[PDB]
A paper describes a structure:
One class of such proteins are the antibiotic resistance (ARE) ATP-binding cassette (ABC) proteins of the F-subtype (ARE-ABCFs), which are widely distributed throughout Gram-positive bacteria and bind the ribosome to alleviate translational inhibition from antibiotics that target the large ribosomal subunit. Here, we present single-particle cryo-EM structures of ARE-[name]-ribosome complexes from three Gram-positive pathogens: Enterococcus faecalis LsaA, Staphylococcus haemolyticus VgaALC and [name] [name]. In each instance, the globular NBDs of the ARE-[name] were bound in the E-site, and the α-helical interdomain linker, consisting of two α-helices (α1 and α2) and the ARD loop, extended towards the PTC. Our structures and mutagenesis experiments support an indirect mechanism of ARE-[name] action, in which a conformational selection in the PTC, elicited by ARE binding to the ribosome, leads to antibiotic egress, and hint at a rationalization for the specificity of LsaA, VgaALC and [name] for PLSA antibiotics.
Numbering used by the authors:
A (entry chain 7): 2 to 43
B (entry chain W): 2 to 91
C (entry chain G): 2 to 274
The structure:
RNA sequence: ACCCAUGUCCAGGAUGAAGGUAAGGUAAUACUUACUGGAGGUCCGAACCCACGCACGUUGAAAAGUGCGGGGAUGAGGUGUG
RNA sequence: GUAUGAGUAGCGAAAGAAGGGUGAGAAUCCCUUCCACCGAAUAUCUAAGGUUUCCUGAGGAAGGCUCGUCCGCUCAGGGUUAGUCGGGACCUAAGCCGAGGCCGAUAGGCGUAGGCGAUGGACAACAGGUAGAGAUUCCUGUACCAGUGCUAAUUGUUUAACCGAUGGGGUGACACAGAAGGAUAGGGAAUCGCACGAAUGGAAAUGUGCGUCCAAGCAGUGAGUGUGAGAAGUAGGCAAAUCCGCUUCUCGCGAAGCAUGAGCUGUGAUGGGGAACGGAAGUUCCUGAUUUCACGCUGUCAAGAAAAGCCUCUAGGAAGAGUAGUACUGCCCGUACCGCAAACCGACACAGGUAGAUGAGGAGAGAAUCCUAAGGUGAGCGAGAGAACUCUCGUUAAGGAACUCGGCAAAAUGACCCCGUAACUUCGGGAGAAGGGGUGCUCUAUUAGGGUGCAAGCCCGAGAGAGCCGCAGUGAAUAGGCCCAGGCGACUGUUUAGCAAAAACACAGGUCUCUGCAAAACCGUAAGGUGACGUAUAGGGGCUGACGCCUGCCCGG
């Protein structure tokens, strides 16, 4: 089998906004993506 | 805010086919509730409402060349009235 | 008693078990059950700190009074029960109050007997007294290091201490290890050994049964790689190519005493095992 | 990979451990024969899991597979969700 | 950017044919008929995931490995209806966050209360119709849960009808295996009805085909399975208790009563569905579940979630209370479609992978296997020559391992029954050892005998004879090659995902060693944790590696 086995819950609870904003080093990711100007933050 | 809850009727062949059974397909605010829609219709047309149904629709993806975007998110209520009441016309 | 299994296949070729005569019921006390959840040597952090643990049959914690705070009240012994959470067995006790508790089963404790606690309790298997009020020579278990904390020291199966004297505020106790120790005299203990004396004699007989008991495989260091163990490596079977055998963290394994050299318990310890 | 909690899956057949009952047998035990019983990291064997051999593929149907055979298959089992 | 190879390799596992039709144009689209494929699936549901791919009408630029008049493609319009389904407003598990707090150069780490969090627990609706697209949603009928008001009766007022926790207690609340039963889904016979009654020698019936129904709910019943009953008194259940728990007496048990309880009978039904728009028959019997009773019973050891919800108990609150019938009320999200697949994961319309419920018949132990049913498909390049070589297959004179690193591969064995079965043995095994024989059909045969049943009838089918035919009778497919000797490792198991399955790892067992509990050891700066909710018959580390007989000398380093 293969390595992407999707799940919305897993996706969001790992890589999602609240998981980023829970963590000091995930708010930098968002600061850094807003600094490049990405249409999508997480 | 009845006139704000009830945005539009849904004029289509399905809807017209269904009007003869005293059922009316309205497009409504996506934050409305079934019960709000009931009392709003009863206000605005002086009918009696027996039952109110409701579905939510995602937006469809459309194109015009280089440019994609989803049509607006829709909420479609299907009111039905007590048989011993007066009709909404269209 | 012990039950040899006939060698009907090589998993049973030398399996032995218990026949479980001492046990009368198989329905524990729901009001005294609590849950347990396997940790598999994992930690606060999630890291495997203590190896060789994980993945057995699940268990419930049976709440066991080691303190014996219920003084003077008589308790009828109702039943003796298996506890997976210990080698010993546990005896259920209905007090005349209506309270129900469990205790360690002592050797010879029978269903139907009556149990007491406190200074007015005769020296009889099941009764718990302060070492202040226990005569020399008697055999005890479930000793506590501190009053009111609970019995803490001899609790396992077939296990017994023996009183040797007094030192005023203290009392000398030969624990099961041969260690004579000074323990306070306001510290309680039970009279008697422990019921499951046969426990040590059981041949598990099968790899799976240690798994069921919750015990993962032990891998030796002489097989590991040098990154993984100081006995690792060598282009074959290699001996312990070091001054001493070694744990996976240095720190010699054989003979090396790991007790702290400046411990507060030193002078309460009268004779090391 | 290891683990945690919670679930779920394993067609069908075979063998016949302890124990128990009865007859025989004894001063009484032994002990024998039958029947019952249903144990097992038990057997055979699909699903499921694995991957022993060979061939083919080898700018592949596929960045590790296909076909013919092969091992385990109530357990140290397989798998799902988190 | 364009060449070269080069009009080359390839066009991605498989059965199509013809006739009609549409159309500018047809191997490729639509229809029909024959044919073929899957069928414990190549069917039917449905999670997760994808997110409009669904339907309709136009279209053929590009995409589709060809083609295209078609599409999961492009445009444009439409389509997803819930008090009862599933998730929330109900509960909690692992885990996560975490007021305060404890730690810590900062940042932050841990963590109590508390709160989130299903893969689990609780919880009330069933059957039909639905011709473009949804259905326990809509519609038709019949109901259920919770609440509200309106009527009509009844009752209560402070020694208080009633409600009753934010607290207490019982249940909830549970493993694994085994066996036997009851019932039912299902399957199949006659029976009943409807149609046919026949092409090619024969048959007007021992003829052929098709079908031979219906819930939830309400009332009643019930294979049965569990369970002893009352009275007193209470050192206990953060306070309280009329409840639980404990104790003591009385009456004792294939007898009731109380809980559950599959299913069954009548209603529901003067309805619906259904083979000829209408509407026939709907009985009897056999087999029989992997479903349900039901983790109910029995046994075992490895000793098998919590909380809510339910019932009760008081603490309390109490002037309004419940009964019947009425009519009304009942929120949010999802609901299309795919869902062993061309729509998910794989860059592809990829021979890969993808959880669970159902999953029929003959023969059969069987979800094996062969053929098939319902139902789905005919796999997105073709036709035609039938040459070397390559691949997958099939058969081969005589010999039969001479091949070869090596019997690699292939061939052979193969199923049920019967006879019989060695050395050795840890007395269980070896052992399906080996080696051999028999299997078909017909009559004795509604069989000897069994199962079922009130009987009629309906299934299973034991030997035996007497015969018949073939080269051959598990006539197909599916289904062990065996033996002797030896080394290694006892064993089952694990291992280098993607060159090594092993004599390597583990294993039970042995032994040494450490450790007195704020154990030792480990993670971490510390707090905090594992260890362990354990306590030397326990825990950590090292070595050895079942079992048997044994394990010797040396302490100078
Ligand atoms: K769920
Ligand atoms: K079949
Ligand atoms: Mg809805
Ligand atoms: Mg260990
Ligand atoms: Mg190595
Ligand atoms: Mg090193
Ligand atoms: Mg070394
Ligand atoms: Mg060497
Ligand atoms: Mg050397
Ligand atoms: Mg086995
Ligand atoms: Mg085998
Ligand atoms: Mg294979
Ligand atoms: Mg097998
Ligand atoms: Mg699978
Ligand atoms: Mg996972
Ligand atoms: Mg060329
Ligand atoms: Mg070619
Ligand atoms: Mg098959
Ligand atoms: Mg379509
Ligand atoms: Mg094309
Ligand atoms: Mg929640
Ligand atoms: Mg549909
Ligand atoms: Mg659907
Ligand atoms: Mg093709
Ligand atoms: Mg030949
Ligand atoms: Mg020949
Ligand atoms: Mg040769
Ligand atoms: Mg040669
Ligand atoms: Mg071979
Ligand atoms: Mg081995
Ligand atoms: Mg490999
Ligand atoms: Mg290999
Ligand atoms: Mg060992
Ligand atoms: Mg500490
Ligand atoms: Mg070794």
């Amino acid at each position: 089998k293969r390595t992407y086995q999707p799940s919305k819950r897993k996706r969001k609870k790992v890589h999602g906004f609240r998981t980023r904003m829970s963590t000091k080093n995930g708010r930098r990711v968002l600061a850094s993506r807003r600094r490049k100007g990405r249409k999508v933050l997480s | 805010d009845a006139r704000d809850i009830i945005k539009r009727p849904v004029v289509t062949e399905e809807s017209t086919s269904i009007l003869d059974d005293k059922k009316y397909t309205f497009e409504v605010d996506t934050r409305a509730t079934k019960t709000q829609v009931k009392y709003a219709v009863e206000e605005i047309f002086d009918v009696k409402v027996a039952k109110v149904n409701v579905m939510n629709y995602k937006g469809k993806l459309k194109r015009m060349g280089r440019y994609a975007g989803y049509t607006n998110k829709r909420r479609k209520a299907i009111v039905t009235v007590t048989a011993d009441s007066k009709e909404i016309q269209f | 008693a012990i039950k040899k299994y006939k060698p009907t296949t090589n998993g049973r070729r030398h399996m032995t078990s218990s026949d479980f005569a001492e046990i009368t019921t198989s329905t524990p006390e729901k009001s005294l059950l609590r849950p347990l959840k396997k940790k598999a040597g994992r930690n606060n952090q999630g890291k495997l700190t203590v190896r060789h643990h994980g993945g057995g049959h699940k268990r419930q914690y049976r709440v066991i009074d080691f303190k014996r705070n219920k003084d003077g009240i008589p308790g009828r012994v109702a039943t003796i029960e298996y506890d997976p959470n210990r080698s010993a067995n546990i005896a259920l006790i209905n007090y005349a109050d209506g309270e129900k508790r469990y205790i360690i089963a002592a050797k010879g404790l029978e269903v139907g007997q009556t149990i007491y606690s406190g200074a007015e309790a005769d020296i009889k298997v099941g009764n718990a007294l302060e070492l202040k009020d226990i005569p020399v020579g008697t055999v005890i278990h479930n000793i506590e290091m501190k009053p009111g904390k609970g019995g803490q020291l001899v609790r396992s199966a077939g296990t017994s201490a023996q009183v040797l004297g007094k030192e005023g505020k203290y009392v000398l106790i030969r624990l099961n290890s041969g260690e004579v120790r000074m323990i306070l005299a306001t510290c309680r203990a039970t009279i008697g050994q422990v019921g499951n004396e046969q426990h040590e004699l059981i041949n598990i007989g099968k790899a799976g049964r240690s798994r069921w008991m919750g015990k993962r495989p032990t891998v030796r260091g002489s097989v590991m790689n040098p990154n993984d163990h100081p006995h690792g490596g060598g282009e074959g079977k290699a001996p312990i190519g070091r001054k001493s055998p070694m744990s996976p963290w240095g720190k010699p394994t054989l003979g090396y005493k790991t007790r702290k050299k400046n411990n507060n318990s030193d002078k309460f310890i009268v004779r090391r095992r």
